[PDB]
Amino acid sequence: MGHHHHHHSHGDDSVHLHITHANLKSFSADARFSPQMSVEAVKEKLWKKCGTSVNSMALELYDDSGSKVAVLSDDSRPLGFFSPFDGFRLHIIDLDP
């Protein structure tokens, strides 16, 4: 077999959020998300879909230093307008097993 390498030039605006599920040791899922998405939006999006309380699932948003940069004021602020980072550390504290 060979290897497919297709480069289609598009300077799209999306950050590489490293979503790590605490149930796993290393869950390498850096999904491209448009940084115009608010925390408010993603909550109700799953809320209306599943119909459940996402209270037992906390979002420990860490930086490169090792502190939680989630101040909850970011709930309504464009991530890509607040802090210049290629990808933030999303360690999901999923306490609902």
Give residue limits of the domains in the chain.
Answer: 15-97
Q: Starting at the edge strand that comes first in sequence, how are the strands of the sheet with 15-21 ordered?
A: 29-33, 15-21, 89-94, 57-62
Distance, CA of 32 to CA of 23 (rounded, Å): 22
Q: Solving technique for this entry?
A: NMR
Torsion of CA 60, 62, 66, 68, to 10 degrees: -60
Class of domain 15-97: alpha beta
